[PDB]
Enzyme design. Structure first.
Site, PDB file in Angstrom:
ATOM      1  CG  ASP A  76      -7.410  -1.927  19.778  1.00 55.09           C
ATOM      2  OD1 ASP A  76      -6.786  -2.159  19.345  1.00 55.09           O
ATOM      3  OD2 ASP A  76      -8.938  -3.196  18.531  1.00 55.09           O
ATOM      4  CB  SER A  89      -5.006   0.122  33.671  1.00 54.72           C
ATOM      5  OG  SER A  89      -3.801   0.307  32.866  1.00 54.72           O
TER       6      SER A  89
HETATM    7  P1  LIG Z   1      -4.246   2.531  32.359  1.00 53.45           P
HETATM    8  O1  LIG Z   1      -4.818   2.554  32.993  1.00 53.45           O
HETATM    9  C1  LIG Z   1      -2.977   3.008  32.142  1.00 53.45           C
HETATM   10  C2  LIG Z   1      -2.722   4.073  31.596  1.00 53.45           C
HETATM   11  C3  LIG Z   1      -1.264   5.115  32.149  1.00 53.45           C
HETATM   12  C4  LIG Z   1      -1.121   6.511  31.348  1.00 53.45           C
HETATM   13  C5  LIG Z   1      -0.259   7.205  31.712  1.00 53.45           C
HETATM   14  C6  LIG Z   1       0.599   8.599  30.104  1.00 53.45           C
HETATM   15  C7  LIG Z   1       2.027   8.610  30.304  1.00 53.45           C
HETATM   16  C8  LIG Z   1       2.402   9.756  29.429  1.00 53.45           C
HETATM   17  C9  LIG Z   1       3.872   9.655  29.658  1.00 53.45           C
HETATM   18  C10 LIG Z   1       3.884   8.704  28.318  1.00 53.45           C
HETATM   19  C11 LIG Z   1       6.456   8.696  28.116  1.00 53.45           C
HETATM   20  C12 LIG Z   1       6.014   8.089  26.675  1.00 53.45           C
HETATM   21  C13 LIG Z   1       6.854   7.053  26.715  1.00 53.45           C
HETATM   22  C14 LIG Z   1       7.094   7.115  24.705  1.00 53.45           C
HETATM   23  C15 LIG Z   1       6.354   7.700  24.061  1.00 53.45           C
HETATM   24  C16 LIG Z   1       6.549   8.966  22.937  1.00 53.45           C
HETATM   25  C17 LIG Z   1       8.103   7.324  22.246  1.00 53.45           C
HETATM   26  C18 LIG Z   1       8.242   9.073  21.082  1.00 53.45           C
HETATM   27  O2  LIG Z   1      -4.774   1.708  30.901  1.00 53.45           O
HETATM   28  C19 LIG Z   1      -6.018   1.404  31.143  1.00 53.45           C
HETATM   29 TB   LIG Z   2      -9.879  -3.342  17.609  1.00 51.74          TB
END
Ligand SMILES: *[P@@](=O)(CCCCC/C=C/C/C=C/C/C=C/CCCCC)OC
Ligand SMILES: [Tb+3]
Ligand SMILES: [Tb+3]
Ligand SMILES: [Tb+3]
Ligand SMILES: [Tb+3]
Length: 674
Positions: free
Chosen positions: A517, A313
């Site tokens: 999950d 990630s």
């Molecule tokens: P990894 O460590 C990954 C963790 C990523 C977290 C970042 C959060 C970002 C918020 C931005 C979101 C963009 C929006 C996208 C569209 C969503 C709404 C659509 C209607 O995990 C293990």
């Molecule tokens: Tb599950």
């Protein structure tokens, strides 16, 4: 590599069902049965469709070819014929391992409604099928239908290319790929058909195909073995490139160990200990802390002792950027750190503005025109690329072999949790650790069949992989309900197989917005460190959790425990859970040594550097908001004020440096392993 095994002949007969639910509106049911074999993907059988019976008796019988060495599952299901699509009423999967040959079996299935079936497995005198097996994956024997030409629709059910439809009339040709064990037919039209018996030597065959009105077309047909060599590598051993790299790397490790451990002599390759970095996820928090841990390791002259470097990630963001520069580990890290800090601090209101949204959907339309599915993860790739960098970044995982030519960095292992199986990515190979099935990273994304490359697709820009690796969305607080609306509205107007496609398994082996999950957010990259050929001797485990700094490790203990893999027991004392410290040792003395580094603000509160008291002027530098509300390192948050970035980075740098003793101690111990 291969295995010869003879198929059996299964003859299933559908007798009767009893108690079939009716149709709506007091109409009794017009039913039929359908047989599908998991390992015969394109093929169906279908009983006559009786009328208005809740106790229907079909008494028909069908024939299959069963390969004993593969896991064969028979899905038989009763439908009500609707005059719409037909509504299913009974379905049952049946593993036909049970059914023994010569012995005639009668079964009755239920899941009120009951269905009676009679199977008979009979020997046969066909030649044995030629498999290519991994003892857990099996590539069924293929065969290929060359079709030569002298609005034509050739159809071959069970074949990767289902139906081919060409328009020319001047010396065309076609290939079909399909299993040898399929009993099927080629069908041509401008509906004449030629049978294809299983496991026979194919002959030449001519067929004249009638035009409706005008004169007729001719066709030459031969069935043969396939021409293509297996593109997918089936094995539980390390690839050649990795093996080559281990030597290339191992020497620079001995050369770097000697100064760090002030050693008597030079080391032989066979005595060089295998040290791994093992990072967990954690979004932006994981990324910046990791930079810091690497910084520490560089300064201590210890980063050059690290053979393997794995992450999940957020960790992969750090990893991917660093490996862009093919000699990052030798150059000053504070360049990339600055890159990360600035882009992290830059406000992200722009990334959701309709000028950028245009360029995403525009790249998705361009992407949709090429052989590409449109998945949410592909959009997440574009916005993440847009946050992580200002712009498009044209780098590729294959490109990172640059960073390994001369053993000048560790081997990057990007681990990915799929829908659950682990998929590891290296610049050398990519694949499923569970199935020992791997391809080189260029081909990842391309279209495959039964372990053979069918259509080569251009290797994708690395950010699309970063989305796979750090996906946060399902297949379906106030801050990010607004870019959601901005996106959804800009995007109005708007099935994806992998390289395993076709392969089979050996026998003896309410709506949500995000993923939820727990597996997705709580694991370290252990699986990479314990893959068959790797033999790790020391692991530096970096954990970026803001609670439960030992869960990810205990998961790993479990993981290794279930596979008979030596691994030291992680049993932290009550005191350790409550207030953990910068470094924890763990240790069946063939198991790796394990230094675990929690994400804790411990002695850094009152120390500005290892062993140095904190001046009252820099006291603020040691106060790091890792708990309590308005903590800026929450997973959600992806803008880090430059001040906040620095605290966490220096904390991380410090926590590792201040643990130099234990690392060197551990390295000494790893040396005397052998
Ligand atoms: P990894 O460590 C990954 C963790 C990523 C977290 C970042 C959060 C970002 C918020 C931005 C979101 C963009 C929006 C996208 C569209 C969503 C709404 C659509 C209607 O995990 C293990
Ligand atoms: Tb599950
Ligand atoms: Tb009817
Ligand atoms: Tb119908
Ligand atoms: Tb219906």
């Amino acid at each position: 590599q291969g295995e010869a095994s003879t198929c059996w002949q299964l003859t299933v007969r559908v007798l009767e069902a009893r108690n079939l639910r009716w149709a709506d509106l007091l109409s009794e049911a017009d039913p039929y049965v359908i047989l599908q074999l998991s390992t015969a993907p394109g093929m169906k059988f279908k009983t006559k469709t009786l009328t208005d019976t809740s106790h229907p008796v079909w008494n028909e019988a069908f024939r299959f070819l069963i390969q004993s060495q593969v896991k064969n599952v028979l899905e038989l299901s009763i439908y009500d014929e609707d005059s719409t699509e037909d509504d299913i009423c009974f379905k049952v999967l049946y593993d036909i391992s049970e059914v023994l040959p010569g012995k005639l079996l009668r079964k009755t299935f239920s899941q009120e409604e009951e269905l009676d079936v009679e199977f008979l497995m009979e020997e046969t005198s066909d030649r044995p099928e030629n498999l290519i097996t991994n003892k857990v994956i099996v590539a069924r024997e293929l065969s290929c239908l060359d079709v030569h030409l002298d609005e034509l629709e050739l159809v071959l059910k069970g074949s990767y290319e289902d139906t081919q439809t060409s328009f020319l009339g001047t010396a065309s040709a076609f290939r079909f790929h399909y299993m040898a064990a399929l009993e099927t037919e080629l069908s041509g039209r401008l509906y004449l058909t030629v049978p294809l018996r299983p496991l026979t030597i194919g002959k030449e065959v001519t067929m004249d195909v009638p035009a409706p009105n005008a004169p007729g077309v001719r066709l030459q047909l031969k069935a043969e073995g396939c021409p293509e060599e297996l593109a997918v590598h089936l094995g539980f051993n390390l690839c050649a490139e990795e093996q080559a790299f281990l030597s290339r790397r191992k020497q620079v490790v001995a050369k770097a160990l000697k100064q760090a451990l002030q050693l008597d002599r030079d080391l032989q390759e066979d005595e060089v200990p295998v040290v791994g970095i093992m990072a967990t996820g954690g979004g932006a928090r994981a990324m910046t802390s990791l930079y810091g841990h690497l910084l520490a390791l560089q300064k201590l002259g210890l980063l050059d002792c690290v053979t393997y470097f794995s992450g999940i990630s957020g960790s992969t963001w750090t990893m991917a950027h660093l490996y862009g520069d093919p000699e990052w580990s030798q150059r000053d890290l504070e360049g990339p750190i600055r890159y990360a800090r600035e882009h992290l601090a830059k406000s992200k209101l722009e990334v959701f503005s309709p000028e950028r949204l245009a360029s995403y959907r525009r790249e998705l339309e361009l992407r949709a025109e090429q052989g590409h599915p449109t998945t949410f993860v592909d959009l997440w790739a574009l916005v993440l690329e847009s946050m992580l960098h200002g712009q498009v970044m044209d780098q590729k995982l294959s490109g990172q072999r640059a960073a390994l030519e001369r053993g000048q960095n560790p081997l990057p292992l990007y681990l990915s949790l799929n829908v659950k199986e682990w998929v590891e990515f290296s610049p050398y190979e990519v694949g499923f650790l569970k199935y020992g099935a791997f391809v080189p990273p260029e081909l990842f994304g391309s279209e495959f069949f039964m372990g053979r490359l069918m259509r080569r697709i251009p290797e994708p820009r690395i950010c699309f992989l970063e989305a796979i690796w750090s996906n946060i969305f399902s297949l379906n607080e106030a801050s990010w309900l607004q870019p959601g609306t901005a996106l959804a509205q800009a995007f109005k107007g708007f099935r994806s197989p992998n390289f395993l496609q076709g392969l089979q398994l050996h026998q003896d082996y309410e709506p949500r917005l995000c993923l939820v999950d727990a597996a997705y957010f709580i694991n370290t990259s252990s699986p990479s460190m314990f893959r068959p050929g790797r033999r790790l001797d020391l692991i530096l485990s970096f954990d970026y959790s803001l609670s439960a700094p030992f869960e990810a490790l205990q998961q790993t203990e479990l993981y290794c425990r279930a596979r008979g893999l030596p691994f030291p027991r992680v049993e932290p004392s009550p005191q350790d859970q409550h207030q953990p410290r910068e470094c924890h040792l763990f240790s069946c003395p063939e198991a790796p040594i394990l230094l675990h580094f929690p994400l804790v603000n411990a002695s850094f509160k009152d120390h500005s550097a290892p062993g140095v008291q904190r001046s009252p002027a820099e006291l603020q530098g040691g106060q790091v908001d890792l708990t309590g509300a308005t903590c800026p390192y929450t997973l959600s948050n992806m803008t880090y004020k430059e001040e906040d970035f620095e605290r966490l980075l220096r904390l991380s740098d410090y926590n590792v440096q201040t643990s130099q003793g234990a690392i060197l101690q551990a390295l000494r111990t790893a040396l005397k392993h052998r």
